Design an enzyme around this catalytic site. Sequence first.
Site, PDB file in Angstrom:
ATOM      1  N   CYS A 184       0.833  -1.209   0.000  1.00 26.45           N
ATOM      2  CA  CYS A 184       0.000   0.000   0.000  1.00 26.45           C
ATOM      3  C   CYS A 184       0.864   1.253   0.000  1.00 26.45           C
ATOM      4  CB  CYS A 184      -1.005   0.013   1.154  1.00 26.45           C
ATOM      5  SG  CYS A 184      -2.377   1.227   0.966  1.00 26.45           S
ATOM      6  N   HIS A 213      -3.875  -4.790   0.381  1.00 23.08           N
ATOM      7  CA  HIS A 213      -3.253  -5.345   1.576  1.00 23.08           C
ATOM      8  C   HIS A 213      -3.355  -6.865   1.567  1.00 23.08           C
ATOM      9  CE1 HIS A 213      -2.528  -1.685   4.077  1.00 23.08           C
ATOM     10  NE2 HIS A 213      -3.455  -1.181   3.278  1.00 23.08           N
ATOM     11  N   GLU A 268      -2.031  -8.987   3.491  1.00 23.56           N
ATOM     12  CA  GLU A 268      -2.184  -9.496   4.855  1.00 23.56           C
ATOM     13  C   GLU A 268      -3.639  -9.413   5.338  1.00 23.56           C
ATOM     14  OE1 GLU A 268      -1.129  -6.661   3.986  1.00 23.56           O
ATOM     15  OE2 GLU A 268      -1.310  -5.093   5.497  1.00 23.56           O
TER      16      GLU A 268
END
Length: 197
Positions: free
Chosen positions: A77, A179, A181
């Site tokens: 990001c 993202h 994650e």
Amino acid sequence: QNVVIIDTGCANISSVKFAIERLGYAVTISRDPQVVLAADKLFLPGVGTASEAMKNLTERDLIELVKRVEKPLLGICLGMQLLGKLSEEKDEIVQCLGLVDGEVRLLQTGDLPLPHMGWNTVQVKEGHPLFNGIEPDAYFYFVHSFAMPVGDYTIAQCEYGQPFSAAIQAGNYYGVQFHPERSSKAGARLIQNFLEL
């Protein structure tokens, strides 16, 4: 793999570390030049504005270090956006790392809501290993108002009002605008792919 998350000291680190450890890799968090330059794989996280992030990198003596890294590095990001030449604010132009020959600009989404926020698909450059084993219709989670236009560095494209770079690469520097994650199984596999490069 010797895995290091470059210690920008931000809130995203723990979630990134968790995602990597879940894949069976030990994670080191450091901003020490020796430790960082010894890594097999690097992650560069970030949150907030480019101005604050570049200020943070300077104060942590990380500007020149990130530019010296030769092993694969994944910016996430804001971490990705810092790799570019510059970023707009919404005001001044913020000079970034200049490792990728792209600029970061406000998405012009028309009547569509900002930020680009939610689950979207990406359109990948043929056979790029970062996306190996991930279906074309897989969803990643995005939350960003600024973006880098499509260019020579683009390895995945996304469309929200206008086309933009969902992922980029310049030599050993990689970036993703979403993202991973926070993107469930699709994001986990992308992280695994990066670690397995």
